[PDB]
Homo-oligomer: A and B are copies of this chain.
Amino acid sequence: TIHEFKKSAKTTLIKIDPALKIKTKKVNTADQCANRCTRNKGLPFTCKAFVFDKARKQCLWFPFNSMSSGVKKEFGHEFDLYENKDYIRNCIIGKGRSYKGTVSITKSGIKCQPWSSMIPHEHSFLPSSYRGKDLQENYCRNPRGEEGGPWCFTSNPEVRYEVCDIPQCSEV
């Protein structure tokens, strides 16, 4: 169940708007939060994300995610944020500068090289140089808003970088 969530380590979400509902429960593992969220059983809202507090072993289920207005992500070493992929926009606007989905394959079908790997391809596209642009895992990204949309360094030594094949929101 936990794999149709995008995981952001060491992160929680704080609501500013107090009208947005939350539900919390002391639980055993993050897996149990995800199961509850996906099947949405005893939650008075549509679960869009949850946070697992590893130290208190508590689930926090939310009808919002990090891209919702009224909320802020925050560092916290004991938290992991899990966002339901159905609520992370899976199509691109403009050149895809704001794309935060989890596609990690190029247009010709090659798996992306993680941004924090220098192999096979060395580059200066590391997390800290483009803070706010989610150069996490090996996700297709467009940090500088370049022509062909989100792209990545390729796990193929033969191919430095290639664009991915994330549809324009205007495609269909």
Query: Which chain B residues border A89 with CB–CB below 8 Å?
Result: 90-91, 167, 169, 172
Q: Cβ of A124 < 8 Å from any Cβ of B?
A: no
Shortest distance in angstroms between A31's beta carbon and chain B's nearest beta carbon?
Answer: 15
Q: Cβ of A128 < 8 Å from any Cβ of B?
A: no
Instruction: Compute how far the CA of A93 lies from the CA of B102 in the bound complex, rounded to whole angstroms.
Output: 21
> For residue A42, which residue of chain B has the nearest CB?
B109
Query: Which chain B residues border A88 with CB–CB below 8 Å?
Result: 90
Shortest distance in angstroms between A105's beta carbon and chain B's nearest beta carbon?
Answer: 5
Chain A interface (Cβ within 8 Å of chain B)?
Answer: 3-4, 40, 43-47, 63, 67, 85-91, 93, 98, 100-103, 105-109, 111, 164-165, 167, 169-170, 172
